[PDB]
Design a protein around this ligand. Structure first.
Ligand SMILES: CCC(=O)N(c1ccccc1)C1CCN(CCc2ccccc2)CC1
Ligand SMILES: CCC(=O)N(c1ccccc1)C1CCN(CCc2ccccc2)CC1
Lengths: 114, 114
């Protein structure tokens, strides 16, 4: 029922180097309009690293801004995490997670003057 | 079927001031383990401002880091966006959006040496 995800990439890198992770979705992909990467370093809580939605909007944790990039190939149903300028603080297990985001409401208008 | 969201807050603020937005969920809330705030300034694409998942992990766009805080009351099924140190660049329509995030995989191990 849920979309099937296969996570690839990772292994060893040198400090200063780069790695690319990938996550391939298959099965019930039509409803999936969000994908995200988390990580967990030993002893610490799992944290959200990067996320992307179907429109291409992206968001990153402070700890990886500018160094990591999340991208997608919509037709292949694959998302990548490019990880640049690595340090030993990036050692962790990385998790790909799917999401189904809901409909748009009307929203609320915010006007800031002066 | 989908969770019902009611967005509140917003209106006018002065530059330098603060506002708090809120979004109240009801109905099919049990499956909802992510909530997010987007915004759209006129003529620009809608962008992801802040998101939170059931574990409390949060993520922010670069443009609001440190000024905006997303929080939740799990028992009331309400999320808030506290917006501090506003500027005219924060004028926009703000949208609350729900999400259902998938199961955890085993992940991939990344080890950075030296
Ligand atoms: C942000 C996530 C997202 O929106 N998706 C996604 C999911 C997992 C990994 C990468 C992207 C979509 C899932 C559905 N596919 C449909 C592809 C298609 C369309 C028309 C004909 C044939 C095939 C589009 C991308
Ligand atoms: C990150 C989103 C999230 O995970 N949620 C959420 C959804 C919308 C807005 C705020 C938070 C949960 C939705 C379900 N509620 C159940 C509450 C409950 C539990 C036990 C007995 C009685 C009531 C917990 C919070």
């Amino acid at each position: 029922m849920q979309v099937q995800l296969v996570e690839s990439g990772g292994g060893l890198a040198q400090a200063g180097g780069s790695l690319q992770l990938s996550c391939a979705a298959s099965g019930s992909t039509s409803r999936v309009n969000a994908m995200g990467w988390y990580r967990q370093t030993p002893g610490k809580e799992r944290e959200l690293v990067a996320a992307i939605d179907r429109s291409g909007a992206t968001v990153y944790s402070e700890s990886v801004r500018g160094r990591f990039t999340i991208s997608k190939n919509d037709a292949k149903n694959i998302v990548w995490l490019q990880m640049n300028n690595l340090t030993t603080e990036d050692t962790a297990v990385y998790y790909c997670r799917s999401g189904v985001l809901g409909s748009w409401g009307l929203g609320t208008q915010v006007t800031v003057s002066s």
